């Protein structure tokens, strides 16, 4: 079950013995044998060398170029290309999987990919390999995007072939040139809407464990595409949403600040404009709360994220949902003849007012600032509050034990009195009902010194990690957030209208190997080159 | 009178070190006040509105008084027990503690972000700007 | 009881980030308290003796009370007008202002010197020390 | 209006064909022709290669040294 399924052809391929390989091939044995041994499984045990489970993929991934040439160019029985293993991976998929984001590995992988692609196209120009997908419905480009293989994606997106009868296999072209300025083109097919899974959709919605999510959207066409879509319509849509939200919040706060104080609601309205205005404000606030509730529930139902990805991601949907829940609980208590609805409503109001930082994205500097705040809150509060709480509780218990009897003889009062020392208004002489003044003074001084040292070390440790590697990360995270906003806004079609569209129709290659021409939704980019003429 | 007295920083140019210091002050005022005051004002207004809504009736039942009372927490003289005409003491204490923690985190991040951009590329620019000002 | 409660930092080792934080606290306590407390104590004692000599007679005429009154200036709650039984108000005010300025300069220099040694050679050492502690 | 005003002399200059340039010059055509096409405007559209609008400036700004020598040192 471990070494089972192996065949002499695999050994011959992986020993680099061209003569022995040829002699073994001449025997007439099948060249499509598959090894099912657990040693060849994906991740069933740390030992393992996944290679696509076929000898051709062994040649492809094991530095074998002349060998694969011989296998595919032998008149005896050439090895088929479209063969898919148990998992469904093809030779191209295996090549993508073998990549590990290393310069030598990346150059090797791209070279082998190009060679196999050109050979297959030459031998069988009718068939196209890039459209063949495994069980999971992932194309080689989509698979590379999902696994965060930067090199393969970068090479594929701007693949250029400079050989006759092979131009149509490339994606980047050169429509025209003049002097030092020449205009290129890029194929957007299977980038914005492939009808199964686009590169943008897969990269944007991928969970955080993927290696290089932040640094992947710097590839050439994608950045310009996102910027273009934004400047085209997302700016206007986002600003309108911002305005509507601000208006709603102003209405809510104005309506709530004037709540009547009589006791035991509900309250009977009076025949005056004020009461009608207040009722309208309450109705508007409740409608907004329930609308946000449905939007949040819909998003959570559709995405269905994990548990540890519900704080690293979706950090704002949770907050909006919580605000909606508070509003709903408040109204339920209001109609049940209670008096806690005030507390619920004020909690909701404060949270909603402070939850408007989400709209800074779209303003570069402010977006970066908000991202920094979010990262600090998520990555330092838990690590830096436990120690302070431990110190505070220890010294509070000690001091409360010392005192004999009085107003500060409980635990909450003394906890507050010791907390006051951190907002810089401690007293040091707040009680006199005890004995052994030396003990009291010593304890208070020790607490003050320890907490000041703790805060100083907090600050220095926080600054240390910023060795100037804090802007290059914040900017990338902000760009990713804007990208997800653009994708979401495009997905949620505005009203009944639909005008968003990638770019203009165009003819670039002239004609395919077949007589008919073709169109590929190009996206022209103009560049100026001065050196390397 | 106050504006005129404070408007004598313009005459530091001509004294190298003082000129550089004044240029730094000008750049900071022009490039960080707008970016760093909006967030603080938003937080302050939100929590002030919440607290004012909670209270029932008294001297601190307006908006200006409570805004001032919450602003006092930043010059390090907040009270934490400035009123007793209300219900649900837990809500009051929770709101005040949350505001204090959030504002201290905000100021800390303000400081760290301000320092970050100074990766030692702050004197070579200040000196050049001062030289340009002396040239004009 | 207080010592035991505060002596639970030893169990952070085993949690990487918390272990590093505790190691940093230990190193700072061991390597800066002695070097940075002697100067402050000298300044405090000198100015406390001067002020106590100046005063004539009253509640703050001892040494412990005046030492505490001058220490209050560092937790940010000093008074500057805490007594009126003396002569030569100019001397009193001058002494208090000089003490405040000197101590603030001292704390600023403390902070800058503490930060200076961290030229980013502070994590590679803390991580190694934590690994050694886990090994033991 | 975009490619208007272009003349064969400009192409000859910007193709780096010394022999063809000389032969075209020998024909006797004017060497002070100016192209008014919008492609040659300052910033009327992101495409554009401003060069002073004269062939001599084309030679000057397009790595042409021997060509400009020939243009300025020809007795014709
Ligand atoms: C990580 C760092 C942790 C440090 C935390 C330590 C906090 C506790 C600080 C106490 C250190 C011990 C200093 C010596 C205490 C002497 C107190 C004293 O005068 O006697 C009290 C008191 C006698 O003082 P009296 O009745 O006022 O004269 O009781 C004792 O006799 C102390 C017995 C020991
Ligand atoms: C960016 C970060 C934003 C964070 C800002 C959040 C600010 C709001 C903090 C509130 C978080 C909620 C904590 C739980 C509140 C419990 C309060 C409580 O005890 O009940 C109040 C009050 C009951 O307390 P009681 O009448 O005193 O016993 O009303 C409720 O029943 C709360 C209903 C929920
Ligand atoms: C490392 C840096 C160390 C610095 C520490 C220095 C601390 C001492 C600061 C005093 C510096 C001397 C400033 C001049 C004092 C004038 C005080 C005065 O007005 O006269 C007091 C007092 C007269 O003032 P009056 O009786 O109020 O008018 O006595 C004197 O005549 C001063 C005699 C000198
Ligand atoms: Na204070």
UniProtKB/Swiss-Prot annotation, chain A:
Membrane topology: Multi-pass membrane protein
Residues the entry annotates as binding Na(+) 2: 424
Catalyzed reactions per annotation: Ca(2+)(in) = Ca(2+)(out); Mg(2+)(in) = Mg(2+)(out); Na(+)(in) = Na(+)(out); K(+)(in) = K(+)(out)
Residue numbers binding Na(+) 1: 424
Record-listed ATP binding positions: 3-6, 14-15
Entry comment describing in which tissues the protein is expressed: Predominantly expressed in trigeminal and dorsal root sensory ganglia. Expressed also in hippocampus, cortex, cerebellum, olfactory bulb, mesencephalon and hindbrain. High expression in the cell bodies and dendrites of neurons in the hippocampus and in the cortex. In the brain detected also in astrocytes and pericytes (at protein level). Isoform 1 and isoform 3 are expressed in brain and peripheral blood mononuclear cells.
Biological process terms in GO annotation: behavioral response to pain; calcium ion import across plasma membrane; calcium ion transmembrane transport; calcium ion transport; cellular response to acidic pH; cellular response to alkaloid; cellular response to ATP; cellular response to cytokine stimulus
ANK repeats, residue ranges: 7-32, 53-80, 89-125, 139-162, 197-219
AD: region residues: 465-493
Entry binding sites for Ca(2+): 427
Compartments in which it is found: Postsynaptic cell membrane; Cell projection, Dendritic spine membrane; Cell membrane
Residue sites binding resiniferatoxin per the record: 315-316, 354, 361
Effect of residue 6 to A: Strongly reduces affinity for ATP
Effect of residue 354 to I: Reduces sensitivity to capsaicin 10-fold; no effect on sensitivity to resiniferatoxin. Reduces binding to resiniferatoxin
Sorted UniProt keywords: ANK repeat, ATP-binding, Calcium, Calcium channel, Calcium transport, Calmodulin-binding, Cell membrane, Cell projection, Glycoprotein, Ion channel, Ion transport, Lipid-binding, Membrane, Metal-binding, Nucleotide-binding, Phosphoprotein, Postsynaptic cell membrane, Repeat, Sodium, Synapse, Transmembrane, Transmembrane helix, Transport
PTM (free text): Phosphorylation by CAMKII seems to regulate binding to vanilloids. Phosphorylated and modulated by PRKCE, PRKCM and probably PRKCZ. Dephosphorylation by calcineurin seems to lead to receptor desensitization and phosphorylation by CAMKII recovers activity.
Consequence the record notes for mutating residue 427 to N: Strongly reduces the affinity for pore blocker ruthenium red and lowered channel permeability for Mg(2+)
UniProt remark on domains: The association domain (AD) is necessary for self-association.
Misc. comment: Responses evoked by capsaicin, but not by low pH and heat, can be antagonized by capsazepine.
Oligomeric and partner information: Homotetramer. Interacts with PIRT. May also form a heteromeric channel with TRPV3. Interacts with CALM, PRKCM and CSK. Interacts with PRKCG and NTRK1, probably by forming a trimeric complex. Interacts with the Scolopendra mutilans RhTx toxin. Interacts with the spider Tau-theraphotoxin-Hs1a. Interacts with TMEM100. Interacts with PACS2.
Annotated family: Belongs to the transient receptor (TC 1.A.4) family. TrpV subfamily. TRPV1 sub-subfamily.
Known function: Non-selective calcium permeant cation channel involved in detection of noxious chemical and thermal stimuli. Seems to mediate proton influx and may be involved in intracellular acidosis in nociceptive neurons. Involved in mediation of inflammatory pain and hyperalgesia. Sensitized by a phosphatidylinositol second messenger system activated by receptor tyrosine kinases, which involves PKC isozymes and PCL. Activation by vanilloids, like capsaicin, and temperatures higher than 42 degrees Celsius.
Name this polypeptide is given: Transient receptor potential cation channel subfamily V member 1
Species whose genome carries this gene: Rattus norvegicus
Gene expressing this chain: Trpv1
């Amino acid at each position: 079950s471990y070494y089972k399924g192996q065949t002499a052809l695999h050994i011959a391929i992986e020993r680099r013995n061209m003569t022995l390989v040829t002699l073994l091939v001449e025997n007439g044995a099948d060249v499509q044998a598959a090894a099912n041994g657990d040693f060849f499984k994906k991740t069933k045990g740390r030992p393992g060398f996944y290679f696509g489970e076929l000898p051709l993929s062994l040649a492809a991934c094991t530095n074998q170029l002349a060998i694969v040439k011989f296998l595919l160019q032998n008149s005896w029985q050439p090895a088929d290309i479209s063969a898919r293993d148990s998992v469904g991976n093809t030779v191209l998929h295996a090549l993508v999987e073998v990549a590990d984001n290393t310069v030598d590995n990346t150059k090797f992988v791209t070279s082998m990919y190009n060679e196999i692609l050109i050979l297959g196209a030459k031998l069988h120009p009718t068939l196209k390999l890039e459209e063949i997908t495994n069980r999971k419905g992932l194309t080689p480009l989509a698979l590379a995007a999902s696994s965060g293989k930067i090199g393969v994606l970068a090479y594929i997106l701007q693949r250029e072939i400079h050989e006759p009868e092979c131009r149509h296999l490339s994606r980047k072209f050169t429509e025209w040139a003049y002097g030092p300025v020449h205009s290129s083109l890029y194929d957007l097919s299977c980038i914005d809407t492939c009808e199964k899974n686009s590169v943008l959709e897969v990269i944007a919605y991928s969970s955080s464990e993927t290696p290089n999510r932040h640094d992947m959207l710097l590839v050439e066409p994608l950045n310009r595409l996102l910027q273009d879509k934004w400047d085209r319509f997302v700016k206007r849509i986002f600003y309108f949403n911002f305005f509507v939200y601000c208006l709603y919040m102003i209405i809510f706060t104005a309506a709530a600040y004037y709540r009547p104080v009589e006791g035991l609601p509900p309250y009977k309205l009076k025949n005056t404009v004020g009461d009608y205005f207040r009722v309208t404000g309450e109705i508007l606030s409740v409608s907004g709360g329930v609308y946000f509730f449905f939007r949040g529930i819909q998003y959570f139902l559709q995405r269905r994220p994990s548990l540890k990805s519900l704080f690293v991601d979706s950090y704002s949907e949770i907050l909006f949902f919580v605000q909606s829940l508070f509003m709903l609980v408040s109204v339920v208590l209001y109609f049940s003849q209670r008096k806690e609805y005030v507390a619920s409503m004020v909690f909701s109001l404060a949270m909603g007012w402070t939850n408007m930082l989400y709209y800074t994205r779209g303003f570069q500097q402010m977006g970066i600032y908000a991202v920094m705040i979010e990262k600090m809150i998520l990555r330092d509060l838990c690590r830096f509050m436990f120690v302070y709480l431990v110190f505070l509780f220890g010294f509070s218990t000690a001091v409360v034990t010392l005192i004999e009897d009085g107003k500060y003889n409980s635990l909450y009062s003394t906890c507050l009195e010791l907390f006051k020392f951190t907002i810089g208004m401690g007293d040091l002489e707040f009680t006199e009902n005890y004995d052994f003044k030396a003990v009291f003074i010593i304890l208070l001084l020790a607490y003050v010194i320890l907490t000041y040292i703790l805060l100083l070390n907090m600050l220095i440790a926080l600054m240390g990690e910023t060795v100037n590697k804090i802007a290059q990360e914040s900017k990338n995270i902000w760009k990713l957030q804007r990208a997800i906003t653009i994708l979401d806004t495009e997905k949620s079609f505005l009203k009944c209208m639909r005008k968003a569209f990638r770019s203009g129709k165009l003819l670039q290659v002239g004609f395919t190997p077949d007589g008919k021409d073709d169109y590929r939704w190009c996206f022209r980019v103009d560049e100026v080159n001065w050196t390397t003429w």
